[PDB]
Design a protein around this ligand. Structure first.
Ligand SMILES: [Mg+2]
Ligand SMILES: [Mg+2]
Lengths: 101, 132, 138, 229, 84
């Protein structure tokens, strides 16, 4: 019942990224330093590279939560410019108004 | 030409309410906001969550009181209280209004985990501000 | 004629523990509507005078956040719509009040906080030196 | 017969003392609630149960006096006994805040006000309503059916025994804030205006009658027209 | 001219030396005791009379926030100390 299949794929990416966040964090700490031996860091590189692709947080996309628009989104409200304006122009967004100066 | 939230001129037979008769550039000048909360103030959080809740409450009430709403809802938040002020018509019997009030307040309280109240003001007919 | 004869008053117990001393309470309210802050100021100030609290008021400079959005759903880049959010402030500064007086006043004005108005209350408490610091060990 | 039942009960109570079992409030409330059948035969025995509570240390609740009120409130002439029983019960309960102890505590005020109307004693009705207004005692008035019965008897007694200037103050304080009146209460109010020679208020009582759902009451419209004409 | 509280008594029972000096704190809540406690909550059951009583009721039930506002209300991180 999500807007489209692309939103459903991002929902699953956010879920899998949340489940592997602690593991990826711990493995990454082994790689992000010059203290541990290279032999141990090379093994950590292979370990984090073997985790599922959809656990990587860079693949998450901030889509409009009502229309799934992938661009033109305002992060504070998580709405696309078109949907945001529709609500703002009907006076349904508390404290938001047209700007003239 | 601009279109957003503008009821366009007609033959003089279209009744419009005060809210519908004002374009977006009159917000904060001649008309207030339909929802009041602290989410959009500087340094405040959770504006996104308050927005989704408002959009749902407006659709819920529209379909829960079908053909009864005579104007847009006014949503107010104080602390963790949620007040819903609606202007309805005088066509449904009072018994059905009391049923729907008790039903909607209870259902929304369990859905959003907060005390919800619904205040109804009845009017004999849709208040007309002008005929466009 | 139909008036209550005797009223049960809420029980206020005097404890044996000493009370907190607040040097200052800085109540900063934020809102979108200046008139609402004016009414709230009048209410909060009148409430403080009746309870015997010394209070001052001033208005920090407002903040206006503006941003721009495209006007058309498609192309027409050189045509935008600009929006803003206005945050107006009012600062109530209360001085020399105990912890019990601060709990009553804050509860009274926080419950009556109008919709669309947030509050940030900064409390400056007075404390004595810890006993370990009053002298060096050696 | 009563003597046979009263002999068995006194045997259980003596058994309860042989087994080292202490009676509670419900032990004496059940006795008083079960003696309601015998009425006159159980009037003096019932008062022995009350004095038995006070001595032992059990404090009578609102239900204890409700059962004594209903026991003495038998159809007949209440002036012989029911007079001094309610007068002594109110001197004991005067200025007391009550707590819920027995399931039948929410039936006293309905019973106490029912006798005040039978005795036609307005000073006693003010003491009953005064006790209902001290502290949180107003929550013992009972469900809606009991609340309407309490105010119907209370206001109908005001219209009868109270001055019309004070009657119209209670009329504004109680209706509709406290309860909605029965069509017979509007007729008792008109009969009070007639006795007071204040008929300029009749048009107001008709306006209020319609606002209380008595627009199509035959007995009411005939009463109003007869007084005016 | 005789008060009702003066006269004969049953004399079957005896004055409690003192009320139960030590209670049964760990008494089990049998179905008979849990149901009799609900019959005592019904004798004081009345509809809310004004807006203050609705706020008082919601506060006792836990629906309404307690004032003055404490942003940490209901959240103690397992009673941990700062040195942990
Ligand atoms: Mg990206
Ligand atoms: Mg243009």
């Amino acid at each position: 019942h999500y807007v489209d299949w692309r939103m459903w794929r991002d929902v699953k990416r956010r879920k899998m990224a949340y489940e592997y966040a602690d593991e990826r964090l711990r493995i990454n700490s082994l790689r992000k330093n010059t203290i541990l031996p290279k032999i141990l860091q090379d093994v950590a590189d292979e370990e984090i590279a073997a985790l599922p692709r959809d656990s990587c947080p860079v693949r998450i996309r901030n889509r409009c939560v009502m229309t799934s628009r992938p661009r033109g989104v305002k992060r504070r409200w998580r709405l696309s410019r078109i949907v945001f304006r529709h609500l703002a122009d009907h006076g349904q967004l508390s404290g938001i108004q047209r700007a003239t100066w | 030409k601009n279109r957003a939230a503008r009821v366009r001129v007609s033959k003089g037979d279209k009744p419009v309410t005060y809210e519908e008769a004002h374009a977006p550039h009159y917000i904060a000048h001649r008309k207030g906001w339909l929802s009041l909360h602290t989410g959009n103030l500087d340094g405040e959080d959770h504006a996104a969550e308050r927005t989704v809740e408002d959009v749902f409450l407006r659709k819920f009430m529209w379909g829960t009181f079908p053909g009864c709403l005579a104007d847009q809802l006014v949503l107010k938040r104080r602390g963790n209280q949620l007040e819903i002020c609606a202007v309805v018509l005088r066509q449904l019997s009072p018994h059905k209004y009391y049923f729907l009030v008790g039903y909607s307040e209870t259902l929304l309280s369990y859905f959003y985990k907060c005390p919800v109240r619904l205040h109804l003001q009845t009017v004999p007919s849709k208040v007309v501000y002008k005929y466009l | 004629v139909d008036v209550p004869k005797d009223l049960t008053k809420p029980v206020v117990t005097i404890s044996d523990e000493p009370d907190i001393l607040y040097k200052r309470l800085s109540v900063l309210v934020k809102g979108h509507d200046k008139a609402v802050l004016d009414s709230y100021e009048y209410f909060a100030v009148l409430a403080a005078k009746e309870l015997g609290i010394s209070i001052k008021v001033h208005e920090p400079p407002r903040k206006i956040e503006r941003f721009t959005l495209l006007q058309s759903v498609h192309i027409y880049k050189k045509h935008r719509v600009q929006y803003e959010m206005r945050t107006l402030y009012r600062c109530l500064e209360l001085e020399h009040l105990t912890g019990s007086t601060a709990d009553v006043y804050l509860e009274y004005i926080q419950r009556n906080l109008p919709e669309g108005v947030a509050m940030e209350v900064t409390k400056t408490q007075l404390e004595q030196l810890p006993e370990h610091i009053k002298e060096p060990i050696w | 017969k009563f003597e046979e039942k009263w002999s068995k009960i006194l045997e259980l109570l003596r058994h309860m003392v042989a087994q080292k079992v202490k009676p509670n409030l419900q032990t004496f409330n059940t006795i008083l609630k079960c003696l309601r059948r015998f009425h006159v035969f159980a009037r003096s025995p019932a008062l022995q149960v009350l004095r038995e509570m006070k001595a032992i240390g059990i404090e009578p609740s609102l239900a204890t006096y409700h059962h004594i009120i209903r026991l003495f409130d038998q159809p007949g002439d209440p002036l012989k006994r029911s007079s001094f029983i309610i007068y002594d019960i109110m001197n004991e309960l005067m200025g007391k805040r009550f707590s819920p102890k027995d399931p039948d505590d929410d039936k006293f005020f309905q019973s106490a006000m029912s006798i005040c109307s039978s005795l036609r004693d307005l000073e006693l009705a003010y003491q009953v309503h005064g006790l209902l207004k001290t502290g949180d005692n107003w929550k013992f008035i009972g469900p809606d059916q009991h609340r309407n019965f309490y105010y119907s008897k209370f206001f109908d007694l005001i219209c009868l025994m109270e001055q019309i200037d004070v009657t119209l103050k209670w009329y504004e304080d109680l209706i509709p804030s406290a309860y909605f009146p029965h069509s017979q209460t509007m007729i008792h109010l008109l009969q009070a205006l007639d006795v007071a020679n204040r008929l300029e208020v009749i048009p107001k009582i008709w306006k209020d009658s319609k606002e209380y759902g008595h627009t199509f009451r035959s007995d009411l419209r005939e009463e109003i027209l007869m007084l005016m004409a | 001219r005789k008060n009702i509280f003066t006269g004969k008594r049953l004399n079957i029972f005896d004055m409690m030396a003192v009320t139960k000096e030590a209670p049964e704190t760990d008494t089990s809540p049998s179905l008979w005791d849990v149901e009799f406690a609900k019959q005592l909550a019904t004798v004081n059951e009345q509809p809310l009379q004004n807006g203050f009583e609705e706020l008082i009721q919601w506060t006792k039930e836990g629906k309404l926030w307690e004032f003055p506002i404490n942003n940490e209300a209901g959240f103690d991180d397992d009673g941990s100390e700062f040195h942990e």
